[PDB]
Amino acid sequence: ALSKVKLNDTLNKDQLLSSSKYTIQRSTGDSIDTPNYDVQKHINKLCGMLLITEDANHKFTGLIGMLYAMSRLGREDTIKILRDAGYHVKANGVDVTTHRQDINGKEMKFEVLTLASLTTEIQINIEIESRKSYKKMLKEMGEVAPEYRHDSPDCGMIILCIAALVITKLAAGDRSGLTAVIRRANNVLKNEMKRYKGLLPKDIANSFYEVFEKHPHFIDVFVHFGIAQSSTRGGSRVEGIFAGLFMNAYGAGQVMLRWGVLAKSVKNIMLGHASVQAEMEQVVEVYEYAQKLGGEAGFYHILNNPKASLLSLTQFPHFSSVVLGNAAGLGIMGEYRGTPRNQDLYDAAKAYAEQLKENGVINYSVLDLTAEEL
Amino acid sequence: ALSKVKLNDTLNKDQLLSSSKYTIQRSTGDSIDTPNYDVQKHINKLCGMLLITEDANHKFTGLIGMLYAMSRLGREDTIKILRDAGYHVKANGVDVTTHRQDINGKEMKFEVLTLASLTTEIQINIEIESRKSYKKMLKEMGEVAPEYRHDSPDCGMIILCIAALVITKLAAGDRSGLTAVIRRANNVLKNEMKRYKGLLPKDIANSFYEVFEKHPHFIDVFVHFGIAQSSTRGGSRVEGIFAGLFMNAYGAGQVMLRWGVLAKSVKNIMLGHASVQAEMEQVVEVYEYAQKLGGEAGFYHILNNPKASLLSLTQFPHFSSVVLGNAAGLGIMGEYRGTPRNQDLYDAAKAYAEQLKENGVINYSVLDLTAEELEAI
RNA sequence: CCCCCCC
RNA sequence: CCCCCCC
RNA sequence: CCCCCCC
Numbered sequence: 001a002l003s004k005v006k007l008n009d010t011l012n013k014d015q016l017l018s019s020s021k022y023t024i025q026r027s028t029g030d031s032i033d034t035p036n037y038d039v040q041k042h043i044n045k046l047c048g049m050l051l052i053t054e055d056a057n058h059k060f061t062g063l064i065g066m067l068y069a070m071s072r073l074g075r076e077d078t079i080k081i082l083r084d085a086g087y088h089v090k091a092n093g094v095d096v097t098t099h100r101q102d103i104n105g106k107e108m109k110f111e112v113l114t115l116a117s118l119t120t121e122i123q124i125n126i127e128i129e130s131r132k133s134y135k136k137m138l139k140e141m142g143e144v145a146p147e148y149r150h151d152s153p154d155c156g157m158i159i160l161c162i163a164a165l166v167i168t169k170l171a172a173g174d175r176s177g178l179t180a181v182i183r184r185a186n187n188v189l190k191n192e193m194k195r196y197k198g199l200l201p202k203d204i205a206n207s208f209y210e211v212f213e214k215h216p217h218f219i220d221v222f223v224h225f226g227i228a229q230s231s232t233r234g235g236s237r238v239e240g241i242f243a244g245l246f247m248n249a250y251g252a253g254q255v256m257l258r259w260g261v262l263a264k265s266v267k268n269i270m271l272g273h274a275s276v277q278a279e280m281e282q283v284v285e286v287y288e289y290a291q292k293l294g295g296e297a298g299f300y301h302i303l304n305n306p307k308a309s310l311l312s313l314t315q316f317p318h319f320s321s322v323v324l325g326n327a328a329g330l331g332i333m334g335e336y337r338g339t340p341r342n343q344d345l346y347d348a349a350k351a352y353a354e355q356l357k358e359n360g361v362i363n364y365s366v367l368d369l370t371a372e373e374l
Numbered sequence: 375a376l377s378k379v380k381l382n383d384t385l386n387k388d389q390l391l392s393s394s395k396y397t398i399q400r401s402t403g404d405s406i407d408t409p410n411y412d413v414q415k416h417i418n419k420l421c422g423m424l425l426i427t428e429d430a431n432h433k434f435t436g437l438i439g440m441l442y443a444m445s446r447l448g449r450e451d452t453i454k455i456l457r458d459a460g461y462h463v464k465a466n467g468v469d470v471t472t473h474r475q476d477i478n479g480k481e482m483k484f485e486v487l488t489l490a491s492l493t494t495e496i497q498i499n500i501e502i503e504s505r506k507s508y509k510k511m512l513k514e515m516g517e518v519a520p521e522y523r524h525d526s527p528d529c530g531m532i533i534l535c536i537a538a539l540v541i542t543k544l545a546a547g548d549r550s551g552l553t554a555v556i557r558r559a560n561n562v563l564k565n566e567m568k569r570y571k572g573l574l575p576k577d578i579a580n581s582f583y584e585v586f587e588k589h590p591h592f593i594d595v596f597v598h599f600g601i602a603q604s605s606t607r608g609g610s611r612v613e614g615i616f617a618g619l620f621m622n623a624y625g626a627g628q629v630m631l632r633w634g635v636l637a638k639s640v641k642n643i644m645l646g647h648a649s650v651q652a653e654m655e656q657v658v659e660v661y662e663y664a665q666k667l668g669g670e671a672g673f674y675h676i677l678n679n680p681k682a683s684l685l686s687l688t689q690f691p692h693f694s695s696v697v698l699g700n701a702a703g704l705g706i707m708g709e710y711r712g713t714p715r716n717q718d719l720y721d722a723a724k725a726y727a728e729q730l731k732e733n734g735v736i737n738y739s740v741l742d743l744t745a746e747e748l749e750a751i
Numbered sequence: 752c753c754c755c756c757c758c
Numbered sequence: 759c760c761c762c763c764c765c
Numbered sequence: 766c767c768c769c770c771c772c
């Protein structure tokens with residue numbers, strides 16, 4: 001039978017990768033700081049110091065943010081996530097030590113962390129500049145409220161909130177999302193920006209973009225932290241904001257998959273086209289593959305998962321075009337940098353979708369109506 | 375087939391979070407007082423002291439209320455709830471000690487608790503001001519009845535009754551509910567307010583609002599206490615009031631879910647609309663998800679559970695609008711701060727719902743009627 | 752190669 | 759982001 | 766909040 005002449009390449013390719021007899025292990029570099037729960041409070045204070053600092057130097061915030069996420073996971077778990085990801089790790093133990101240095105003649109004491117990635121000389125400067133901003137703040141308002149200070153438990157998570165926004169736009173893979181990252185960091189997180197002078201979306205977002213670009217293993221660390229954080233029973237409102245923003249990243253780099261379901265849901269006529277119907281057998285394969293993977297597939301593009309390519313609908317020019325057309329006709333795309341391979345099908349689908357948002361007839365068969373006198 | 379082109383994002387997102395291989399542990403701060411059952415009676419007396427005090431300082435009532443809830447749970451269980459929630463806890467043992475201090479020259483004895491959160495100096499002042507209010511009360515009525523005194527077992531739970539009302543309106547997350555909290559604390563809990571001069575709904579409600587804002591882990595403690603309390607076989611009438619008020623919180627921050635079932639139940643015509651029908655596949659996913667979670671989902675918004683966002687119907691502009699319309703047409707909303715994304719669908723649904731409350735024909739097929747002679751009646 | 756919107 | 763009523 | 770009769 002001609003029905004038997006088929007080959008499920010999408011499923012078979014996944015099968016090949018899922019059933020590997022051998023494994024690779026990547027060298028991360030020299031050393032990774034793995035802070036445990038004991039150091040967590042200190043990192044939160046360090047995060048707060050950057051947040052209180054007016055016109056702060058967010059060169060290290062991306063890395064500091066990562067340290068806080070790791071301190072929440074705790075040494076044991078963070079090492080486990082690094083090893084499970086496929087990395088050879090030389091773990092550096094983070095401990096609190098008192099450093100004595102004479103700044104402006106007067107000998108001063110500082111509580112610093114034993115970090116390889118962060119110098120003790122740069123750590124003291126974060127505290128130095130924060131104290132300047134704190135005394136200026138104390139001079140302006142007399143007494144500083146718990147909301148405006150570096151001590152606040154929200155501090156670490158506030159920084160990680162923009163990290164969740166960076167992760168949201170990593171699918172583009174070129175820092176193009178930065179504008180949207182800043183925009184959203186202003187709409188959401190508005191109250192947080194009021195309390196902290198150092199909450200500079202652009203500055204912090206670039207720092208995280210840099211850390212994820214320079215250290216791709218940290219993106220795996222963050223994604224797994226975010227999931228672990230989102231597994232919690234409850235928490236603060238800032239922790240709720242983070243969880244929401246982190247979940248906005250789920251399904252990034254696979255918008256066509258969701259827009260495809262939309263086109264079906266709105267019943268765009270162009271889906272029934274002969275050239276679109278030819279692709280159907282194979283488009284179902286990818287949808288069934290996406291269904292099979294479940295939650296796992298959500299962060300496939302964020303973390304550069306090799307199997308992310310398998311979820312592409314771009315390989316089907318006709319279906320992608322009607323899907324993209326429907327999205328344009330419903331006015332839901334833009335400035336989406338996706339181009340339709342078949343222009344005629346796109347234009348036809350865009351036209352029908354534009355006509356759909358003008359009509360709308362009531363389907364009385366859906367409702368459980370008895371004696372109708374309507 | 376085009377029927378196969380689907381993706382259950384709601385279910386998959388939950389699956390991802392439910393199957394986490396790794397865990398986070400949060401630092402609560404420095405120390406949390408974990409009082410055991412032995413200290414429970416003392417806290418109830420302290421609660422009673424604030425309740426007998428005319429124009430009492432309810433600055434610490436939110437925290438004292440939490441201590442009573444923890445003393446009912448008992449050290450072991452409270453530590454367990456804190457650890458299960460995802461918090462690193464340095465437990466402080468609460469013990470009763472006698473403190474001698476000379477107030478107005480005369481050396482006085484006081485029974486105080488070894489609390490980190492509450493100073494022994496502030497504890498004595500609660501007792502000092504209560505004694506003043508007690509002697510004034512003794513001068514007014516001669517003999518003080520068991521209902522009017524601080525000794526009463528209801529005291530601790532009376533304070534926790536307004537804590538249940540605060541928890542009821544935490545979904546708004548901005549203290550906006552305070553007006554309703556006070557209002558309800560007057561309708562319900564009316565007899566309790568008669569017996570206690572210090573039962574100031576506004577003052578106590580703000581204290582609990584503050585404690586839940588400053589210490590988010592305490593909201594987890596309270597919710598779990600409330601469930602544990604509501605698991606009881608029986609109790610006092612005040613304990614019954616609490617249980618009822620605590621259960622009013624179940625499903626807060628998810629009113630649209632319940633109003634959606636209402637729209638279906640009343641058979642609002644606008645549900646059959648083309649743009650509403652397109653969303654249907656996905657709206658069922660969330661309803662089935664809510665059905666799957668069961669009782670767990672009830673306090674998802676109260677405790678800032680990460681998965682609470684997944685229960686939102688706001689992501690479906692058309693369905694939400696008809697649901698909100700039906701709620702307005704039936705006159706059940708207001709002043710609900712929810713805005714319909716599709717105005718035309720809302721107005722159409724509001725109109726139909728208004729027409730529904732005017733009609734009403736009897737459906738005789740529902741009843742198990744045999745030989746019908748009602749048409750003659 | 753894949754990706755690219757909004758929230 | 760989510761939420762927001764009444765009881 | 767719930768409840769509220771009779772036997």
Ligand SMILES: O[B-](O)(O)O
Nearest residue numbers: 092093094114115
């Ligand atoms: O543990 B180290 O090497 O002191 O940082």
Ligand SMILES: O[B-](O)(O)O
Nearest residue numbers: 466467468488489
């Ligand atoms: O147990 B403590 O430390 O005495 O309160």
